[PDB]
Amino acid sequence: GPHSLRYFVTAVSRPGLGEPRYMEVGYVDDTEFVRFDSDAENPRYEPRARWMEQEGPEYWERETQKAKGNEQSFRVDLRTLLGYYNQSKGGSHTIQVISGCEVGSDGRLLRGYQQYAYDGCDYIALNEDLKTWTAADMAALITKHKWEQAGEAERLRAYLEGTCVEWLRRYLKNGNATLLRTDSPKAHVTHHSRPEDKVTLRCWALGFYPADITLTWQLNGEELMELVETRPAGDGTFQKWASVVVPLGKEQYYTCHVYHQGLPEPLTLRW
């Protein structure tokens, strides 16, 4: 399959309580593998996946100082954006960054992305071409213009096409046993009463990896439905559920179907 390296980046000003909080969290696919948090005792990049213990002192030093530069860089952006948006200097604000690359199974680039949001609204993003920017508003244009004049897209493209890809390969290979594994869903269906004479049928899928899965309910052929977003279960696997309200005495005519990378035939079950 194809795979991803992702960094979720967040800087959060806390005026009156000191310097902004800076976090970088990295994933390969759906697995958290690295993290820096400026609020840790002594902030440095740390492994979040066992396979990253392989990497030597130079790697952790190089990522940590990169991390610490970015912390400063986002420190400045927060102050800069107050200017851009004529904002008071006493409120807390957020910058978020999604940065990464996807590759296909041949280990070649499918997609690169880097997207910014200020206070939860889009600010700026690399476009798919990997040479131009799309800015969400008038403020983002100012930024856009700086990056064009400084040639940031081309530096970012060197990263998405070079550094980002080669390290994703490295990590997959280094974490093959964890990252290329598949754990299959185990499913089961639970029953609840209600009024007036109805019934909630809830289908559970548990213990699966990767996070991707599809749960559907059926009344004899036609697909039907409350659910939750697929969610991490604390050990590097995921779970989900999907429920339908049916008539009491008609439960047998409804079945739950579960489709996952680890199910050659999708599962079929009923209460």
Partner: peptide, 8 residues
């Protein structure tokens, strides 16, 4: 490995 982020 993360990118060195630019300023805005």
């Amino acid at each position: 490995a993360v990118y060195n982020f630019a300023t805005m």
